[PDB]
Design goal:
Chain A: Keywords: ATP-binding, Cell cycle, Cytoplasm, DNA replication, DNA-binding, Helicase, Hydrolase, Nucleotide-binding, Nucleus, Phosphoprotein. The structure is cut from a larger assembly and holds chains A and B. Chain A is α/β, with parallel strands linked by helices. In chain A, about 25% of the residues lie in helices and about 10% in strands. In chain A, a hairpin with an 8-residue loop joins strand 5 and strand 6. In chain A, helix 16 packs across helix 17. The longest helix of chain A has 18 residues. Chain A is elongated. In chain B, helix 1 crosses helix 5 and helix 4 crosses helix 5. The longest helix of chain B is centred in the first third of the chain and has 20 residues. Classes of the chains: A alpha/beta, B alpha+beta. Chains A and B meet through helix 5, strand 4, strand 7 and strand 15 of A and strand 1 of B. Chain A binds a DNA duplex through loops.
DNA sequence: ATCGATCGATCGATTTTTTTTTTTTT
DNA sequence: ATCGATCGATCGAT
């Protein structure tokens, strides 16, 4: 009626713009014929569903409707303001301009499109002997449509919609708007197919029923609306036919603020967004992206009279996504810069943590666990690690925590952790109530998350018992055991293990004997193959030279020089598993020799006897590992020949792990 | 040659293609394994089944490939697994009955054929984890793996509803049938009518077990950062309770999704449908 | 014409809900 | 806000 709900004029009109839409639709120049022709048949070809659109090309054809007239009102200035009218009406012209066949449907291919022709086979035959309802254009689509906005070099044309923004930068006037913001993903609760229109079937009168559903809910129809059952005493029964009704894949995510955008006060703002179509599964939780999409509110249900006023509360929809930080063939050559350089075991050893000065010998062993291997298979079976567990003992911090910052970063499956920090419940699959979608789904991590990869660790003395026993079992490795609740499972943890821990308070006392200084259990240290004692005595010469490096930065961003060229991880990492494919086989020559030095070590460590320097007893596990060491060391040489120097090279690192306690 | 409406897979003759497939295989599947027991897998195992009267055949899948015919049935089963099992469980009955007529009097005698037989097909292609799953996949057989997070207590389900009126009082009732229960306002006894409320004693009506199990699959190959998603399942009969919780399993079934009332008072259903496994077969 | 059942317009009732300060045990 | 039952009348049957 007039008055209430008044009809209101706006200077903007798409009536001829829809024609101007089809002027732009199909026909086009810049990219034989226009890009929109065979590409729209490309969807008619059914090798594509998602329809991708950008604001970039609209400007040129708008320039093409411009320069180059006749002059026409701009679409794009009417887009970012609404653009939801463009997600349909601009798109609704596609049935008019789309080719009929355009090729063979075959059989499969797929279902649906074989049924949808049957639905239209049933729909057209309804009117065949009938002599007039038809399937709405929205009822049969089968293809998604997307928009990617212009930043851009077009904005400096000069020409806005693409300017990255904070959640804090989100105005209320941006509702309805196709917009773009940078943000960190969060949640990313699982996607599920959602129907636009139920298909009920009358049975008795048959036909087909299509009722639209919007947002979260709908009110389902009943009885029979079919006209054959209309005005007849008998109304047919109907319920939803899921094979018939169309579905849409629906994902969603919260988007956190980058935290540099944030004000000094307040709080990071999570932003709810909902993923749909081919755009689904395009994101993971915690990833940083410039998000581009239209922003619309989805009230209400309710409540209702509760809200009031309405106070929309809205949400954002995802139009498009731009993510931040997205053989043994020819990459062997990318290995070959340092292959021709040689010194794989050193230059790469020097390649480790170029940021921290000295302790390259410590870094020297770092290269081994970063590689490790190679395990064994006894066929019993019992598999043996296979993995290096390294500990670092010294205080104060020395910036030891920094070594883990570099190592895990480079390392695949790199996981940095600390005593508290992740608990043993954090290293196990632990039941927790899932917000929104329910319920009580288990989420594991840490050890379970770090399996088949290195785990860096700090506050290792403060991990207490609950962690110690777990990692005590994590030293049994290849397992994580939970008898808790109804959960009886034991899950494989392939985790590589390294934790640096601080000596007994306040710092280590040279008078203090070994193992009295350490805060860790002996059985906990016995399954350790290596520990590097970090005790720091001031050396005026060394203090300057290191201070000099501490002078050298902040002075500049580039540390390494006079002289060296640390390998970048990507090219460096590629040699890792490339070397890990080797699996060196032991030569018996070095084989028995390692046995020889063992009974020597089984002798000398025991002849140390009571207290003092220690540690005994030189158990076979270390030899079991020391053998694996040359097996890990051989991998850097590859060649799987296991040299004796390659063997003895580890034995050199064995005594060095200790004996610095004299310093 | 008839047809099935949406299935576009004609009734019978697939039963025939099923039989000559069931009647003769040997190994054409070894042709894919490239050879390197000569008799067909089924007629031996089909015999193995008849004595025990266990029914519930576990099928094979894939023996429809590589072998002919059924090459399309191999497809047509994967297109519409629900209806395919419907003909096949019945045909196995006749395929037993057809087997018994040659040996004539068997198992004392024709009543053992009256016993129901059914296929529990497995190894349909290879499904990819869970998280990969498509909307288009609405109903199709799926190979899956995971250990059971929790086993719920067995849930009772409707088969044939029991009914009565004020008069006489009389016991006339109708099966639950579809997902709806339709009770006449009247009436049985006196007939009559009269328009009495229809009495329902639920202890009299039929029941069967459907036992819900939430299952977290561990397909590995985890997309990272994807969460350790879990899986809903209902199952039925022997499939019910036969699955211990906490055990990694090959259990297969078609996809399923169904709506639920938002208010749980109002008729309104919430949009998109919640999804669960059809638990077609276990391993 | 008495009686009924039948449909509809009348009437009115039902729509969220668990975490941070604790405290007796060695 | 919608669904629910009361209750009112009316048009057919006997």
């Amino acid at each position: 009626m007039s008055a209430a709900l008044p009809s209101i004029q706006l200077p903007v009109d798409y009536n001829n713009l829809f024609n101007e839409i089809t002027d732009f639709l199909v026909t086009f120049k810049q990219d034989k014929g226009p890009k929109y022709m065979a590409m729209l048949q490309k969807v008619a070809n059914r090798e594509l569903n998602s329809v991708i659109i950008d604001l970039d090309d609209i400007l040129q054809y708008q320039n093409e409707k411009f320069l180059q007239g006749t002059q026409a009102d701009d679409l794009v200035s009417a887009i970012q303001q609404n653009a939801n009218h463009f997600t349909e009406l601009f798109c609704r012209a596609i049935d008019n301009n789309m080719p009929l066949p355009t090729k063979e449907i075959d059989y499969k291919d797929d279902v649906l499109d074989v049924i949808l022709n049957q639905r239209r086979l049933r729909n057209e035959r309804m009117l065949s002997d009938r002599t007039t309802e038809l399937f709405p254009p929205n009822l049969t689509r089968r293809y998604f449509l997307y928009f990617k906005p212009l930043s851009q070099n077009c904005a400096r044309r000069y020409r806005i919609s693409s300017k990255p923004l904070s959640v804090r930068q989100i105005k209320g006037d941006f509702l309805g708007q196709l917009i773009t913001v940078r943000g960190i993903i969060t949640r990313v609760s699982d996607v599920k197919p959602a129907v636009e229109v139920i298909a009920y079937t009358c049975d008795q009168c048959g036909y087909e029923v299509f009722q639209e559903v919007n947002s979260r809910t709908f009110t389902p129809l009943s009885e029979c609306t079919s006209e054959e059952c209309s005005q007849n005493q008998t109304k047919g029964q109907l319920f939803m036919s899921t094979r018939a009704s169309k579905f849409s894949a629906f994902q969603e995510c919260k988007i956190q603020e980058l935290s540099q955008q944030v004000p000094v006060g307040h709080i990071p703002r999570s932003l709810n967004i909902h993923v749909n179509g081919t755009l689904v599964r395009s994101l993971s939780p915690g990833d940083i992206v410039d998000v581009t999409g239209i922003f619309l509110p989805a009230p209400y249900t309710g409540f209702k009279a509760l809200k009031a006023g309405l106070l929309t509360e809205t949400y954002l929809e995802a139009q498009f996504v731009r993510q931040h930080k997205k053989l043994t063939s020819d990459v062997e050559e990318r290995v070959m810069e340092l292959i021709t350089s040689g010194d794989v075991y050193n230059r790469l050893a020097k390649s480790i943590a170029p940021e921290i000065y000295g302790n390259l010998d410590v870094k020297k062993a770092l290269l081994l666990l970063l590689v490790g291997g190679v395990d064994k298979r006894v066929g019993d079976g019992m598999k043996i690690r296979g993995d290096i567990n390294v500990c670092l003992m010294g205080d104060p911090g020395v910036a030891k925590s920094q070594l883990l910052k570099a190592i895990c970063k480079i390392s695949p499956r790199g996981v940095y952790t600390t005593g508290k920090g992740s608990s043993g419940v954090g290293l196990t699959a632990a039941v927790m109530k899932d917000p929104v979608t329910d319920e009580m789904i288990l989420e594991g991590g840490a050890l379970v998350l770090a399996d088949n990869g290195i785990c860096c660790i700090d506050e290792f003395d403060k991990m207490d018992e609950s962690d110690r026993t777990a990692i005590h079992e994590v030293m049994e490795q290849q397992t994580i055991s939970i008898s808790k609740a109804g959960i009886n499972t034991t899950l494989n943890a392939r985790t590589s293990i390294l934790a640096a821990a601080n000596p007994l308070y306040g710092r280590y006392n040279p008078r203090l004997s070994p193992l009295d200084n350490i805060n860790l259990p002996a059985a906990l240290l016995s399954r350790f193959d290596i520990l590097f004692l970090m005790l720091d005595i001031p050396s005026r010469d060394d203090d300057e030279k290191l201070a000099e490096h501490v002078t050298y930065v902040h002075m500049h961003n580039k540390q390494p020089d006079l002289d060296f060229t640390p390998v970048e991880p990507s090219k460096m990492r590629e040699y890792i598993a490339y070397a890990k494919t080797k699996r060196p086989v032991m030569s018996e020559a070095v084989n028995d020799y390692v046995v020889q030095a063992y009974i020597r070590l089984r002798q000398d460590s025991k002849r140390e006897m009571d207290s003092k320097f220690s540690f005994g007893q030189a158990t076979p596990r270390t030899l079991l590992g020391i053998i694996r060491l040359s097996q890990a060391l051989a991998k850097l040489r590859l060649a799987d020949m296991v040299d004796i120097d390659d063997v003895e090279e580890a034995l050199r690192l064995v005594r060095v792990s200790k004996e610095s306690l004299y310093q | 040659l008839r047809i099935i409406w949406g299935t576009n897979v004609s009734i019978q003759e697939c039963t025939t293609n099923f039989r000559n497939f069931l009647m003769s295989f040997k190994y054409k599947f070894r042709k894919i394994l490239d050879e390197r027991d000569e008799e067909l897998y089924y007629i031996k195992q089909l015999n193995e089944m008849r004595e025990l009267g266990t029914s519930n055949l576990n099928l094979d899948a894939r023996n429809l490939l590589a072998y002919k015919q059924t090459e399309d049935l191999y497809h047509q089963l994967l297109n519409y697994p629900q209806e395919v099992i419907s003909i096949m469980d019945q045909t196995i009955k006749d395929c037993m009955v057809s087997l018994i007529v040659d040996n004539n009097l068997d198992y004392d005698l024709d009543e053992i054929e009256t016993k129901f037989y059914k296929v529990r097909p497995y190894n349909v292609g290879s499904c990819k984890g869970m998280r990969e799953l498509n909307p288009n996949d609405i109903d199709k057989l799926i190979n899956l793996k995971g250990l059971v997070l929790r086993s719920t207590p067995v849930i009772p389900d409707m088969k044939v509803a029991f009914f009565k009126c004020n008069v006489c009082d009389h016991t006339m009732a109708v099966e639950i049938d579809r997902g709806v229960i339709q009770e006449p306002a009247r009436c049985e006894r006196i007939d009559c009518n009269e328009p009495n409320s229809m009495s329902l004693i639920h202890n009299r009506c039929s029941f069967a077990d459907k036992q819900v199990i939430k299952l977290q699959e561990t397909p590995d190959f985890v997309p990272d950062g994807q969460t350790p998603h879990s899986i809903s399942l209902c199952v039925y009969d022997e499939l019910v309770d036969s699955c211990r919780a906490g055990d990694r399993i090959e259990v297969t079934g078609t996809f399923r999704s169904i709506p639920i009332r938002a208010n749980s008072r109002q008729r309104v259903l919430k949009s998109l449908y919640k999804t669960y496994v059809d638990v077609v077969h276990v391993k």
